[PDB]
């Protein structure tokens, strides 16, 4: 039987990978960060409250100018906010109201959204007609589209619930690259700062690091006991943090190919919806199902602070590119800006 | 105050957007959101045609009441990752064919379509997001179940069934088996209706169940529920 021999070879390769990870570990992150000063208590106050959504907010994305937001709620509305003045720049009605994710282009010219319609819709913000119109609808995913991230004005990587990540060309609307290898539904997506690699967390309790231009999984990261819902690179792009339903956040290294630290507390039993890093990467902000966001010392696994003030589950998180503020979206149809 | 002309005009645009969002929300609040569920293509299609690729939107109006019926078929994914999107639906319309009690699911060995429907109903009814959501259970294809129960007894599906091979007693037993999966009888109620291939009163039954749900929502809004 060749299948039994190949299963044995796969088990041997997994054992070799585990042994390499174990022998490559000498001193944990906690053991070397215990000699550095803690961040103390991080106190953040709600500076702005963005009202206007009438259903649960499922996703957000900050602009690269650190002032413009896009939010997605089950109203079927993509609202673009001026976070400084709490002004609604745009209100984009969606054909399908079952939106799970929204992205904002780095140039600021486009927004994306998607969800249970299995379609990533690109919207042109800066048109000559003065309205926001659908640039195109990206079809080809057979499951719900759970995350999308713009690479540039013409490239976008979409996470989906068909256990598949996809890279798209927005001029042609075609499937440029398909990323396969996940067993469970891919729920999260994060692009590297150089936008050469990206990580995706799925429902198989596994995180995979992909190469955009090669279309293959380079490394696979395990350690979670439940479905990974959130993922985010470290600001230098050498590490990333995941958030899952087991009330634990893990930090993984790309170069060490191993988990570095777990961010869990005994009083936390609910799942984690969103994971974001501060500008320096010292603070790890995680949104939970128990209605508040917990700030974590990313180097010491210490609860630096709590962002409480949402009456429902905090579904989405985002730190501005200048690190000035963090915005929390929640199922109570509200967005809050914290400093 | 301390705003420029362009700032004031942007604020006015934001206020126009706020108003338009408010009429959109008021229009959406009067619509009835229905989640259509069932094991495979059993009775969803005939129900949809009687009322009127990811999620399918079905719109129909009955007695000046607009209905939004969502079909989550062909969404072969983990339900728990997207079933919370329908937490605020008015009711769940569950379609179960009555004639697939002896059929095999053809996906697993020794797998029964009726038991698959029963486990799907158990997962949906006892879901954490549908604790207070009423279920309009439809037992479809009662004519085929009429004409095929004589040839094939129901005991091949339920070994504990000891009743006679009559349509009324077996249909009552089937409805009792489906309603026994409700572990939250103190906070939700299950509406069971038997539909033929061409049944006209299904829309009226849905309207009555939705009206009961709307009465309950009105009472909890006024503090009586």
């Amino acid at each position: 039987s060749e299948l039994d021999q190949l299963r044995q070879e796969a088990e041997q390769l997994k054992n070799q990978i585990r042994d390499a990870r174990k022998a490559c570990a000498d001193a944990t992150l906690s053991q070397i960060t215990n000699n550095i000063d803690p961040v103390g208590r991080i106190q953040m106050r709600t500076r702005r409250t963005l009202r206007g959504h009438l259903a649960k907010i499922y996703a957000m994305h900050w602009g690269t100018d650190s002032r413009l937001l896009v939010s997605a709620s089950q109203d079927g509305k993509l609202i673009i906010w001026d976070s400084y003045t709490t002004n609604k720049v745009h209100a984009i009605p969606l054909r399908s109201s079952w939106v799970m994710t929204c992205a904002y282009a780095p140039s600021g010219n486009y927004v994306a959204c998607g969800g249970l319609d299995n379609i990533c819709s690109i919207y042109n913000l800066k048109t000559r007609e003065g309205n926001v119109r659908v640039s195109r609808e990206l079809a080809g995913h057979t499951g719900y589209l759970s995350c999308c991230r713009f690479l540039d004005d013409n490239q976008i990587v979409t996470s989906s619930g068909d256990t598949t990540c996809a890279l798209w060309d927005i001029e042609t609307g075609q499937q440029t690259t398909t990323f396969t290898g996940h067993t469970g539904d891919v729920m999260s997506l994060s692009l590297a700062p150089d936008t050469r690699l990206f990580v995706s967390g799925a429902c198989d309790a596994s995180a995979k690091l992909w190469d955009v231009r090669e279309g293959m999984c380079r490394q696979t990261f395990t350690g979670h006991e439940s479905d990974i819902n959130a993922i985010c690179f470290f600001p230098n792009g050498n590490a990333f943090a995941t958030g899952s339903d087991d009330a634990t956040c893990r930090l993984f290294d790309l170069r060490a190919d191993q988990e570095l630290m777990t961010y869990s507390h005994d009083n936390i039993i609910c799942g984690i919806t969103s994971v974001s890093f501060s500008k320096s990467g010292r603070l790890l902000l995680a949104g939970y199902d128990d209605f508040n966001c917990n700030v974590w010392d990313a180097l010491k696994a210490d609860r630096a602070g709590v962002l409480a003030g949402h009456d429902n589950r905090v579904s989405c998180l985002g730190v501005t590119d200048d690190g000035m503020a963090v915005a929390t979206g929640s199922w109570d149809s509200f967005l809050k800006i914290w400093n | 105050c301390t705003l420029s002309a362009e700032d004031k005009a942007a604020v006015e645009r934001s206020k126009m957007i706020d108003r338009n969002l408010r009429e959109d929300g008021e229009k959406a609040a009067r619509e009835v959101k229905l989640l259509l569920l069932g094991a495979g293509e059993s009775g969803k299609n005939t129900i949809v045609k009687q009322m009127k690729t990811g999620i399918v939107e079905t719109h129909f109006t009955f007695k000046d009441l607009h209905f939004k019926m969502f079909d989550v078929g062909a969404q072969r994914s983990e339900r728990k990752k997207w079933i919370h999107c329908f937490e605020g639906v008015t009711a769940i319309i569950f379609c179960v064919a009555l004639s697939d009690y002896d059929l095999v699911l053809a996906e697993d060995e020794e797998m029964n379509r009726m038991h698959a429907s029963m486990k799907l109903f158990d997962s949906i009814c006892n879901n954490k997001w549908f604790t207070d959501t009423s279920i309009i259970l439809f037992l479809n294809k009662k004519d085929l179940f009429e004409e095929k129960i004589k040839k094939s007894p129901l005991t091949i599906c339920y070994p504990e069934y000891a009743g006679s091979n009559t349509y009324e007693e077996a249909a009552a037993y089937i409805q009792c088996q489906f309603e026994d999966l409700n572990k939250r009888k103190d906070t939700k109620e299950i509406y069971t209706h038997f539909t033929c291939s061409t049944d006209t009163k299904n829309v009226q039954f849905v309207f009555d169940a939705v009206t009961d749900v709307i009465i309950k929502n009105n009472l909890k809004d006024c503090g009586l529920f």
Partner: single-chain antibody, 234 residues
């Protein structure tokens, strides 16, 4: 394409009443605030009236206030300028101007072709251009300077300075909308700069396509005031 077509102009006896229409096509007319800007035969842009989106805000110039009426009908995409008691100083070519206002928007971006109407026989921000007509060699850089009585820099960091180029026999177009921001469809050889009350507009590698009259307009507060107009010759 975006198009604004004006109508209703003509020869008018003094004290008469005429109504101007501005048919809009190719853009979402309802979401745009709309301006009327007239230009007398002495070649000077002058703002007349403004109506916001939804008709909630209406402003008039002090010389037409209570005497002109601006209105819009969004179902048929038409902008109206109901004028009564027309006097000889109202003899101008009236431009219907398209402007939208949000964060990062580009108001005054599209101007209509203009309709010509002929009449027979203190606290405002003064916008100043020192040079009214200067000759320029093609292929060489030129600078057009503008000054304002009040500082156009606001507390929010925006300097509300607009640069318009009006080629001979053509409607004005927007080049720079907030003192530095290049407009859409205009070449990168146009650059704007300045601070406070002093402003400049640099055109490196000038071509014959840039020949015209250059206007500086403020949008800090109503009424919107233009410069006298710097004309480039040769």
């Amino acid at each position: 394409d975006v198009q604004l077509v004006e109508s209703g102009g003509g020869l008018v006896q003094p004290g008469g009443s005429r109504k101007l229409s501005c048919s809009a096509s190719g853009f979402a007319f309802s979401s745009f605030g709309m301006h009327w800007v007239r230009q007398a035969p002495e070649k000077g842009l002058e703002w007349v009236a403004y109506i916001s989106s939804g008709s909630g805000t209406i402003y008039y110039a002090d010389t037409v206030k209570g005497r002109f009426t601006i209105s819009r009908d969004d179902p048929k995409n038409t902008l109206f300028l109901q004028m009564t008691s027309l006097r000889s100083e109202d003899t101008a070519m009236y431009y219907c101007v398209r402007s939208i206002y949000y964060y990062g928007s580009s108001p005054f971006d599209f101007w209509g072709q203009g309709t010509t109407l002929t009449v027979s026989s203190g606290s405002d921000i003064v916008m100043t251009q020192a040079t009214s007509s200067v000759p320029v060699t093609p292929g060489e850089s030129v600078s057009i300077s503008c000054r304002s009585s009040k500082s156009l820099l606001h507390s929010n960091g925006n300097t509300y300075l607009y640069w318009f180029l009006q080629r001979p026999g053509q409607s004005p177009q927007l080049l720079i909308y907030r003192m530095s921001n290049l407009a859409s469809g205009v070449p990168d050889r146009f650059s704007g700069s300045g601070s406070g009350t002093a402003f400049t507009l640099t055109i490196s590698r000038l071509e014959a396509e840039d020949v015209g009259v250059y206007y500086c307009m403020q949008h800090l507060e109503y009424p919107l005031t233009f410069g006298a107009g710097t004309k480039l010759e040769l």
